[PDB]
RNA sequence: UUUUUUUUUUUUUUUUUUUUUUUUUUUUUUUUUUUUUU
RNA sequence: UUUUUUUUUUUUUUUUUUUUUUUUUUUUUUUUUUUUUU
């Protein structure tokens, strides 16, 4: 069933907007200042410093930072008759834990912690990607489409981990095993067992993330290692460019600003009656009546704002630029030229410069973003018998496909590194960049409720560069 | 004697003819529509959940489901003026108990329930085998050739347990044994005691199917582990692609649609006077002047769905290709082409699209079909030492040899097996291989 | 260092006592009626069923025995101008649990209630050791001896472990083998995974209370069985004849009646102060100047009820009578000729004829008593190769070895260990067994 | 609880009476021909050959005697005008099964059916002991005072298994050991296994029924024997002469005449509503005020058939003669001058010499019987310590008793058949004649109903003989 | 001439996947900034 | 200087027993009668 599903996570988004509406109360902002995105992305930066209970236990044994007991940050921007301030106020965690607590009638609201901190890895992917650590590493910098959900910390849950892409998963992995080539550390106590957990955890992450069965395989096998030391290194790294084109099945959660939800609990929509949808029209329409506020630097443009805005609030960072402008309707502007900066705002930055001005999210069309993927690879070992039985009692010869009964045979057991490699290269030499996908499925207009009927595009504009980076 | 085995077999579809009299009697359908495969599924559906006594006490004591005291399903299809209609008309089952009390003279027929439910099987194993469960315990996807009765629960008795296939019996004996190895189940009560017992009739139903001496013995000291773990999981996956080659002798019951021997019987063929056969040339000629009527989508052809039904009708889904073709005299396309679907119609599928027309089961040719085996066989501590014997079968195995010396395809004006033609086939590699 | 070791049993005692002194506040009893060990008895059980965490657990969701939502028990005695009457007060666990809180500062004093269920394992052990059980197990009764704390449950820490006997701990095993024999309960749930866990605690609990290696090592050995059988229960019953003379380092909690501290808090003899310790002179001159009555049958004598306490509270009943005897300075009539009964009254008997009587409890002399075995063991594949050993040690003991070289019996005069006097006894065969 | 054990036995006397009711109404006969003993004893015998299911089952396979399809003889004693005459009326099992059915609320009343059979083994133990069968298996004639129960076949339950005596154990398991000497009959098959069931279940009955823990131990070591040959013959039989002097706690079970129990509930004396036992004053009070006739031969007297009756009725032809004098108030005549012969009449007895004469059954006093056994053997291995441990830090020794040591440790284990015959013969010189045993209890009189004071019996009328038998 | 046993929740939307899927903590990092520098 | 874990019904009439204890069938016997006879 899925109306429990959706149930379930219209009163966590209820439960979200009316803890947006206190903070809104408690505040004292005007009704301007409860539409910018950075209180709530401070407000949100606090959320994540008040839950992070890992760190809270590890810096309450290290009282360092100066002023840092239990207050962080806070930078409140304010305006003065058109004019902005900003005020750094601390704020404790204590009081916001059981102002929370009193938010989700009485619950703790993990989900929704993932859900925020998913939305500010989906803004980071966004607005910046490392290739810092990529190299740090030592992986090449070709591969910054598989960063998704980079910044994101062990701590979420399965759905956190659904949404972190593969190659997230092999920078966590390689720190890993650098950490154990490092210094001994697989030892028989309980940290080598605790890390070989998280280890084997994240690992069937993995192949769950896959789809074909010889990646999968070849992940099997590369648990069988014991030891992690070098050869694993370049085993996933070759699993990592692999899966550049036979990519993982990754989720993409679709999160809005802290104050759109806000807004909407506060006009009376209650999602938990009409029910409530992550991945249908829901955050689409939402969106469509939503009033947004952002601030501006002088140099800045607001035009490229609002669709790095929307790349955030959508995690279309890392799809076609074409198929984000059909959505749109007007042309997406790559990051080559984009004369804007991070939406973060430094903490030296002056103030008398700073702008704030309205932000465009409406869009001519919406589609479902399912976590599936490209369909291509189909020409290996086609599913079919190897054996026949005898039904009638005919002279005849009993046909056995006796190269694969060796096969099946050999000795031991069957699978390696390289020996899977080479199926890697031949089905990277069948792909091809024509290969069209998603087949069944289209772009619908807004009208349409129930996904009655799509219009198909159809794109002959040469190369205007489907390449978000470089 | 043979005359016993064949005067009770023509008995027993006898009564079973005369319970599809009565069944037409009583729910007023036509002519045709008492010629439709889709009302005798429903009906032999609701056959075996009324004989399914350990269902039955078990869904008494679990009242769920919504509305199932004792009625399930029933999609009667009829037919208004050419086009065509279901009704969801629910049978309880007692009445329908009774009916089958005095369908046989007042005994149960459990042997005829042994044989509908096969047929429902053999019609399973044509349509569609599970690779799903296969890889649920992890066996690899290339065995499917071994699923023949994967669909027959235990309740059968030996007839039943005549025609279930090695892998089939693979299955359910790891399904056990992945049981007691979650949990500590094989305990000194009576539950431990009585998966025991199942346990070695399963096993010796198993040695039984085997032909070759050496994996009688490799079953026989399987048997001595009184604790099922792990190890015992790839000594039986060794058996079964052992058995792949070193098949086992397995039979193959002739079973025909619930109207075929209804309209038998209702024409006044008597099967008791002049004897029935389930191996010989009875199926074949009763189904010579036998018509049947079947429901088609707007898109499947009724070409295939005919030698599907063949398929169904004498459980040849498993055989070569070639053969079928040469009984049928027309060729039979593998499903790796069919544009046809399964031959059960889903419960949403809407009735305007849905057409019936006739079906073509006449063959050129009758053989008889054995519980034998290939004659390549008679040409050729712990389990390992055996499964050195079996390489070397295995490297002593050819896909030359041919088997059933001294047997042949025969004619049908024949009836007391005199002369048979000899098939040859050259026509190159056209695909010994229904799946795939 | 020791200082602190005794500041914290000062404290503990020094809580328990005053908890006694408001008991006495709270139950409106005489002076006299506050030196009754029978009212500190009932107490101490409702101080036991109130800390059963465990035990209220179970009982809050089994609300049987009638009236027993909180309340067990309590048959409080008093006396009226000369005369008993016994009044069936139910106290609630909660309250009491608060004044515990309040009695010792805030803690939950979870030690005093080690020893507190230790003293009743010494009476109890004092006055009836079950054969019923022994033999129950099947083990034979001639190792009465080694019933030493074996009423404790479970729940009791560390200090309550080293005092339970070798005797206990194998009944304890061996009911959980026998349990685990009836069950296949050993599975890879929690349930097995904590049994196994308290299973190696407990091993590694007796491993430690044994001194020489060869147990030690079988000890270790009998571990290596995963799966419990049949085979370990005679082994554990070896290991157990063999601790017959291969004995235990099993360590002797001297704890004194409830009323004994209260007397002593009272006065004001702050134990914090002076220092307190549980093995040297200190229970000794505490029962110097300490008064106790009882209550006793019109039957039963005081002259041997007097020394079945002193038997309770220095849980001396597992030792020899003569050196009992010595330290007493009278004869200690043995089990056998014994016209006394349990110190418990039953719920049924009369009050008419219960008469009440002081208790002695002075000795002559006090002795030091360590967690040590006798000088006589510093003198000399599979279980069965080592008892051979085992065997081979026991023809090596003598009846004649002496122990406790270096050691001896001191005065109460003196407090700092300085000069004993060496007893010698010549007197025949009084009989050094406790019972027969 | 005892209440619940007295509501189901007066349930079942009840049944019982009701049953007699009811075949008094169908039988057509008089007041004075219901209170005849032969009518029920008849009725009796129909009532076992009825539930006789084995025996239905073999005689279904085996139709001989001539006319016995379902029928057995019934010789029904009527009256007219004084006279007497017997009719062999035949009743089929079949309509009286169904009047049980009705009679016991719908249930099979086995239990009843236990009672009734082991009614019948007291009067034929009261009445004649077979020497022929107990020296057909060759024991000398000296212990006929242990065929207790020996009529009772195997078909009685735990009930019937207890009130059996230790002879007809004995015999019932030589018979089992001649017929598997006679024959190689222990072999692996279903026989062998359910015969080898049926000897450890009559085993364990014997060990229970045994009270001193040497006899109990030499009864485990004869079941070590897994071939029953010629050497356990002579074991078990030192078993049953040991068991002479220390006799087994057999029970007795207070079983009344058929008409006794249906005048009783014609009267309307509910025994559900009051209360009912089997061993306390109940079968006394009811023969306090019950009136019974019996038929009697020309030259047998009514005055030792009384006696005998009584005998019958409370299972004291096994018991001393004087204290069934007390009880009685009048001397009891032992067999050996009794001028009277069995209570069944012969076949072919004429019946112009038969008369009809009432019964005494008033006795002037009333005894618990309890099944315990005397209080002498008491001498041997004293329960009580063997080591000790010390308390006090004393130089002392440690006092070991080695002799047990090693005899606990010996090599494998201990116990034989003449080893502990050893034992059996010490305890036999220690038992004497004069030993009084039941120490605590007493005999008491009528009118007390509570148990509240006895009156201790004392005899030194010389040696009148304490013998029913020689 | 070879045979009707029952043990705690499954399945006809469909033909080779999906299963209604989840808050763990170990010795010093990061918002001056967007692909280097430590 | 060595430590508070919980898994389906027990116990103070009392000191070494008792445990509220149960319808299985395998090849020919027995009521002329009470200790022989086959």
């Known amino acids: ?31 301007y200042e ?24 590890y810096l309450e044994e290290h009282p360092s930072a100066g002023k840092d007991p239990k207050k ?61 650590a990529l190299v740090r590493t030592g992986m090449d910098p070709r591969m910054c489409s598989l960063m998704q959900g980079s910044t994101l910390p062990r701590r979420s849950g399965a759905a956190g981990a659904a949404v972190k892409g593969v190659g997230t998963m092999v920078m966590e992995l390689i720190r890993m095993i650098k950490r154990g080539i490092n210094d001994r550390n697989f030892w028989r106590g309980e940290n080598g067992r605790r890390t070989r957990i998280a280890y084997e955890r994240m690992c069937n992450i993995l192949k769950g993330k896959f789809q074909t069965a010889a990646q999968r395989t070849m992940v099997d096998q590369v648990r069988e290692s014991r030891n992690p ?11 990592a460019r692999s899966a550049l084109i036979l990519r993982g099945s990754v989720a993409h959660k679709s999160c809005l600003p802290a104050c759109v939800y806000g807004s909407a609990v506060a006009s009376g929509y209650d999602f938990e009656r009409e029910g409530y949808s992550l991945v249908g029209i829901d955050p689409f329409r939402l969106l469509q009546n939503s ?92 599913s079919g018998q190897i054996s026949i039985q005898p039904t009638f009692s005919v002279q005849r010869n009993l046909p056995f ?9 050999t000795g031991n057991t069957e699978g390696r590194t390289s020996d899977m490699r080479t199926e890697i290269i031949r089905l990277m030499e069948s ?27 159809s794109f002959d504009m040469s190369n205007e560069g489907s390449y978000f980076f470089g």
């Not at 960049?433 to 499925?441: K, L, M, N, T, W």
């Open 1 to 31: 069933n899925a109306t429990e599903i959706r149930a379930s996570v219209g009163k966590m988004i209820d439960g979200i907007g009316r803890f947006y509406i206190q903070m809104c109360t408690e505040l004292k902002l005007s009704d």
């Open 34 to 57: 409860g539409r910018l995105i950075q209180n709530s992305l401070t407000i949100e930066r606090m959320v994540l410093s008040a839950f992070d209970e890992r760190r809270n236990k």
């Open 72 to 132: 962080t940050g806070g930078p409140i921007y304010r305006r003065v008759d058109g004019k902005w301030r900003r005020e750094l106020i601390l704020y404790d965690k204590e009081e916001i834990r059981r102002i929370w607590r009193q938010a989700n009638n009485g619950d703790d609201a993990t989900a929704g912690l993932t859900h925020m901190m998913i939305w500010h890895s989906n803004l980071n992917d966004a607005t910046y990607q490392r290739t810092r």
């Open 229 to 239: 030391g070098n050869a694993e290194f370049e085993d996933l790294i070759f699993l």
């Open 291 to 382: 009033q947004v506020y952002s601030l501006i630097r002088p140099n800045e443009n607001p035009a490229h704002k609002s669709q790095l805005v929307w790349m955030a609030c959508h995690s279309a960072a890392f799809e076609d630029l074409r198929v984000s402008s059909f959505i749109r309707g007007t042309k997406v502007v790559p990051r080559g030229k984009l004369s804007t900066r991070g939406v973060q705002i430094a903490s030296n930055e002056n103030m008398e410069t700073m702008e704030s001005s309205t932000l465009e999210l409406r869009s001519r069309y919406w589609a479902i973003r399912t976590r599936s993927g490209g369909n291509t690879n189909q020409q290996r070992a086609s």
């Open 401 to 409: 496909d006796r190269p694969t009964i060796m096969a099946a045979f």
């Open 431 to 457: 792909a091809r960049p024509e290969d069209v996908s998603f087949q069944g499925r289209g772009v619908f207009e807004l009208s349409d409720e129930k996904a009655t009927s799509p219009i198909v595009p």
